[PDB]
Design a protein around this ligand. Structure first.
Ligand SMILES: *[C@@H]1O[C@H](CO)[C@@H](O[C@@H]2O[C@H](CO)[C@@H](O[C@@H]3O[C@H](CO)[C@@H](O)[C@H](O)[C@@H]3O)[C@H](O)[C@H]2NC(C)=O)[C@H](O)[C@H]1NC(C)=O
Ligand SMILES: *[C@@H]1O[C@H](CO[C@@H]2O[C@@H](C)[C@@H](O)[C@@H](O)[C@@H]2O)[C@@H](O[C@@H]2O[C@H](CO)[C@@H](O)[C@H](O)[C@H]2NC(C)=O)[C@H](O)[C@H]1NC(C)=O
Ligand SMILES: *[C@@H]1O[C@H](CO)[C@@H](O)[C@H](O)[C@H]1NC(C)=O
Lengths: 99, 49
């Protein structure tokens, strides 16, 4: 048996049961055997008729197509990476401020 | 010399550049749990940066 996986509709798939779609939350997702982690929200990046997912410049998946209801979604990271903590000495006090 | 001249000239100098910060885990692993748990048996190459 010789199979391939590429950006096209799936023909033969494994025996895994689907479940409900959860939006605007940090979840693990498995779309057509493509796994990932992040937040799923609606978007407008109209695809080609056959296209299943779209990446970005960093070669990371950016948008995906729902297989059952042919609706585009997009994936954003769970992590906010611009937080800074103003603190006096932990010896003096245990109070902080957040930027 | 018998006369003179007043001349105004310009000089330009850099003083500073941009300040940046890098998140090690987000750049390497990117919100993965299989990664960032393998990137814990590596050393302290993220505090030293
Ligand atoms: C030293 O050099 C300066 C120039 O750096 C000389 O000053 C100049 O004097 C001449 C003659 O007085 C001025 O010419 C005048 O021009 C006006 C029109 O702009 C005209 O209406 C006048 O009839 C005359 O032709 C010249 O403009 C003036 N330059 C400046 C900047 O004031 C000065 O005379 C020199 N001094 C010695 C000791 O040679
Ligand atoms: C893929 O299937 C979903 C769900 O299929 C429904 O349940 C199956 C057991 C079977 O009875 C199908 O014929 C059913 O459609 C489809 O989503 C449904 O879409 C219809 C409109 O056609 C809508 O009325 C239902 O409420 C939807 N059900 C759910 C649970 O969302 C979906 O359309 C199918 N995908 C394709 C190939 O279009
Ligand atoms: C910590 O606080 C104590 C009690 O006020 C003081 O005696 C000590 O010098 C402080 N030490 C430091 C490191 O600030």
């Amino acid at each position: 048996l010789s199979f391939e996986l590429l950006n096209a509709p799936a023909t033969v798939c494994g025996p895994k049961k689907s479940t409900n779609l959860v939006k605007n939350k940090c979840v693990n997702f498995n779309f057509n055997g493509l796994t990932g982690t992040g937040v799923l929200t609606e978007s407008n990046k109209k695809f080609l008729p056959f296209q299943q997912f779209g990446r970005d410049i960093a070669d990371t998946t950016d948008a995906v197509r729902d297989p059952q209801t042919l609706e585009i979604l997009d994936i954003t990271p769970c992590s906010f990476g611009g937080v800074s903590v103003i603190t006096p000495g932990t010896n003096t006090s245990n109070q902080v401020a957040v930027l | 010399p018998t006369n003179f001249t007043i001349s105004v000239t310009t000089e330009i100098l850099p003083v500073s550049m941009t300040k940046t910060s890098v998140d090690c885990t987000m750049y390497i692993c990117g919100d993965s749990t299989e990664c960032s748990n393998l990137l814990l048996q590596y050393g302290s190459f993220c505090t030293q940066l």
